[PDB]
Amino acid sequence: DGGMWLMQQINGQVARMKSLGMQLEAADIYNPNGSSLKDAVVMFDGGCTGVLVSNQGLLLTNHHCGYDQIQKHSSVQHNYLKDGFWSYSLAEELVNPGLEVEIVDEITDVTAAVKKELERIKKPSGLEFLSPRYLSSLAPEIVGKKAASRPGYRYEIKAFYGGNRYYMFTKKVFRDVRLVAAPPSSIGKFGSDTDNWAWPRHTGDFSIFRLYADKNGNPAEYSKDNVPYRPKRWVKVNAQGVKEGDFALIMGYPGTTYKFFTADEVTEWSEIDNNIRIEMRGILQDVMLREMLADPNIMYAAKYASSQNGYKRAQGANWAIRRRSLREIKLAQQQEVLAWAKQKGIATTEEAVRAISKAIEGRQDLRMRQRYLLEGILMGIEMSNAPAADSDLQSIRKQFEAFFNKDYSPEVEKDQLAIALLTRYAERIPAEKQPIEGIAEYGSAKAYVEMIFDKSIYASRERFEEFMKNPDRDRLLRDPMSRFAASVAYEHQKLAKEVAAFDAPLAAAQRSYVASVLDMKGQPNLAPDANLTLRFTYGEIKGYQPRDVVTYGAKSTLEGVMEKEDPNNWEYVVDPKLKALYEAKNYGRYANSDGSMPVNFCATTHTTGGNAGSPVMNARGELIGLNFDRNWEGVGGDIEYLPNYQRSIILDIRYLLFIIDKFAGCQRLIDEIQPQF
Amino acid sequence: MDGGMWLMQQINGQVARMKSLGMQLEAADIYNPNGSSLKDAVVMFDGGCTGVLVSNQGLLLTNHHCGYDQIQKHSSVQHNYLKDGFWSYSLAEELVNPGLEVEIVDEITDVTAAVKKELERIKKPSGLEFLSPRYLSSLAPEIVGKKAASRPGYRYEIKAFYGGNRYYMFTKKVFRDVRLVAAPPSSIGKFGSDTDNWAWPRHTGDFSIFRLYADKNGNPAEYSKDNVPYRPKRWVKVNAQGVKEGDFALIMGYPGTTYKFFTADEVTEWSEIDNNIRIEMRGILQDVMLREMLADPKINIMYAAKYASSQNGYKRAQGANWAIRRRSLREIKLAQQQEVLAWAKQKGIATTEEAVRAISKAIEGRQDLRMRQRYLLEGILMGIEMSNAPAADSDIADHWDDPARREAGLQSIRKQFEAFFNKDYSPEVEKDQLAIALLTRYAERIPAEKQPISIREGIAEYGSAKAYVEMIFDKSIYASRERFEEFMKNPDRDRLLRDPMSRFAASVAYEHQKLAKEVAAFDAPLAAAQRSYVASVLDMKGQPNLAPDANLTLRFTYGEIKGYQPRDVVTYGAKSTLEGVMEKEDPNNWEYVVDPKLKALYEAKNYGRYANSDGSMPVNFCATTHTTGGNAGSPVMNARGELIGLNFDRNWEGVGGDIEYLPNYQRSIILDIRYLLFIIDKFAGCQRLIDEIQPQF
């Protein structure tokens, strides 16, 4: 069964969980008045999950969650991205400025308070009652100036059930989170392209951090005098192994789902948001791939990586529409609540569904742009955020250092991808409808966008401080580069403002519709959409049947890595040390009882983007794995959980330990984790 | 699941084991030299396939891709049998196929002593004749005598076995009136043509149907309007009750070629030269050719068989190389040669180590020559059809003043031009990108000095392969049929003698013959050493328990219906269904298009009595039998010798089975006879064929 359950809903799920073999009490998982698993389950860097596993604040999350921190610490000497990183003491752990981890201190229902504040906003705009920015801004009104005021704390208020409930999360915000360990990328992201969203999977997707705190255990900014955070509760690691049918529990921070989409919303989300994305990324991939198949990657692998991650997802979603009859399932569900309302003489529900249809039909062309603009150029062309004058000198200097940084590259992406992202965007979106005429003067979108390189001072690093001697203001003000930037940004804000006339009634009607779903279903029985707050899902360890003749098992092994090895294909390179371990069968206590070395497994838990790094626990609440992905067949799970295809893809905790111990020899961390055999 | 493509004479050695796996046949039921047996119904089709006789009126089942040549030849845009299939509702509607031959084994005879006797007569031999089919055939008339060797509908085939340590003669009845009866649309006969080729799971209705015709007296015969169906003494009964995992399966047919006695150095050479070069050049050809086919239905027809054949060998080379890597095939053959060498050493025998060394030396010696041969063959001879251009003979060059011999020389040119500029040939696809793409790469791989003269000189004179090919088509009289005929109204001796396409064909042929002459210096010692090596393997293992390499003669193999584990986490079942066709359906992908009628049947579950017991509709199954190319169309029989399927492929993981059979990875891929009947019945509604086949429930 699917559902991303509120921590407050554990009491409604615990009986079913125990019938599936769970041996925890509800209070063990979430305790409003004490220590529980809620305290060990962590948000990492805004969009990932992590788990605390020691009394010294040791933190496990995915490799791909800690990737940039790993990268930032890498040079040719000390190449942690390629070779992995291992610290042998507290003092060796690496500082990560800007990295934040959050822990839920308390969850409170603020629905009534939020409502009675949301009433009569002067000129109630379109989307206040859904905006996380405006909602969390109400925290001083709810809890007084010990909100925001308190340095290591943050009050998160979000809408649930389309805004029919509001829950407040009291976060402890740690700003001293240090890098402890990482496997090499050949393990951390084995098969990163071909195997992304794929089961079977053979990826050692983990990294290790540690929460530091001040001398009395309060979350603090970085200081040389900080000590390890000593958590209330951490999760004990169980290294005894897993088998098909074992109960599994996942807690984490699922990002976004759309389980209350109506039929018309499903179709739009497909034929607009989905396929506009697939070939706009289909094109932003081949030109990107052609360009540096020929050249020596760290220049643009992180580029091709994220495009692909979202690219393949979109293909998975599209498969569910075509094969899993997603639209008709959502249509059936809304017809069921419609019939429920009709029977009760309720009129708002059909009105709600009709207004949703109306807003979707009407915003069709505007949404077309805003997503065509969002990744045709907005993330597909890097200097759409070139600096702009305040001169009306002190911070075009202090801003260009953020434009041309340690990741950014003027050098190339010129008319291989820059011209290519501009593409024939303008064919699908008439030049009538493009931002503030250039494609009409310099000829093409290439001879326009490449003309900027010579003319703009914001092309090189040399030219910036070449004429740092004086104010060429008549030249600084009229630069096409910061014109193209403010331009694409101009229409972005205008579209946000213009389509708001559709988004506002949509949100009102969705709220109305979901209220009806709420009156129909038990609120305690209905899981809300994911919204980047702490949820639990449960299931069992289980493969599936992907297609005629074929069965996928629930557990993968090191043999599967060796079957995939290909020295000539970057993604399938196998570390010589890992191969020697395989050839020697040097697995120790970490092997399966049958003698194979476990790598990944999969489960019928309901996860989504944001669950990377979530702890997977057994019937006793002990750690058995870390979530890092979902199969492409289960992508449609964001709209309707798909029990016979959807599987979370999970790192077997024994493989993580094996990598620490046998591969890296970092005994220090085994001693700290204290795995149970 | 043991390997081995057993001789018919080896049936006595295997029958006990076959029975232990559940067979309920006696040896003599399968192969009987003193009367009739299943052998009599197992047919060689078009020289390179198998077929099976299934009625008393000569009805013949084989694969779609085996009948593909004939289907293609009968197809036009107007009557597109490739695309839409073909179905005949009477004898008179069955299509005539000139040149198509089918052969039946009447007798098998050991002629080892008589061939060796004849070989010893050769004063100063090349060293190539004892494996030369041209030579071995020339011996038959002495062996069998002038009478009976001049018997019209018979052929006496002598082949080398065990590297030339045995010779067997196969007396063949040759049928030269074989008519096309039925074929499914390609969307069924070759569903997933490229992507599913060499793959399990498989969902392909790979069959076609023919009929043997004969004269007045039921004798094999050349085509005649007066011919009638041939009435075989034996035909295989068809069982439509279905199959299950674990069932015994027997396959008989004509496996073409295996290399089970390759030494490790031979494995490496085959992989790094023959296969790599095949993959490289055929990849280039296919990219251009398919593009052309998908853009024009007439081109699609013209080049359908050429493409399918090219793609088939291309992907087979990919699979063999992948097998060698993933399954350590080189290491296995090394271990096998070490075992025969240790056996030799124990017995004080020195000939074996000497043979293994002579094999390695010859392989190392011929590297440059063999790579040049493969590039020429794959790059030019197989895919540039210019290489069959006409060339003027010596009557043109030296007898032009003789009106008689001049006319003969002109007719020879015309005869060549018809063969070259055939109905399947498009000068447009040749000259636009195809010949240039191939020749450009060929020129990059083969040094100028080692290229055919015309090509070297042509590329030096004009800028490039591109400019050179463009010149050829600009200047050649054979560029088009219209230019050819305009020229032949007033022939010029010069230009005819100097024609650039002629010079290209001449130069390529000269280099081909040149390479063969020079490489014989290595190939002859290599063959002699192979003979010595296999002779030791024979001394070690004994002939009765050692299956020889395939050589396109009748063999049996047996095993059970069984899936396998291709890789970690994954298990493949033994049987595929129609649902898997529907899962693969994609209107925008040419190879996964699904016929609307087939989909209607599936949605209506209209399967008659052909369904599985669980209500699914069967499509294919796989078995642990040991097959290879040539076994396409082979009857797959159950424990009682009844037909339950037709072999048509081998799985990906099993492609390397020509080097080493691997019981945990190699599976024959088989058309379930129930799907074949379903397609004839529910899909085509060709009732008369169901009636004739008489499936047993």
Ligand SMILES: N[C@@H](CCC(=O)O)C(=O)O
């Ligand atoms: N890979 C996703 C997790 C997908 C899932 O668990 O469904 C992430 O980075 O958060």
Ligand SMILES: N[C@@H](CCC(=O)O)C(=O)O
């Ligand atoms: N497809 C092959 C048969 C391959 C096999 O059975 O191993 C052929 O056309 O003969």
Ligand SMILES: [Cl-]
């Ligand atoms: Cl286990």
Ligand SMILES: [Cl-]
């Ligand atoms: Cl499902």
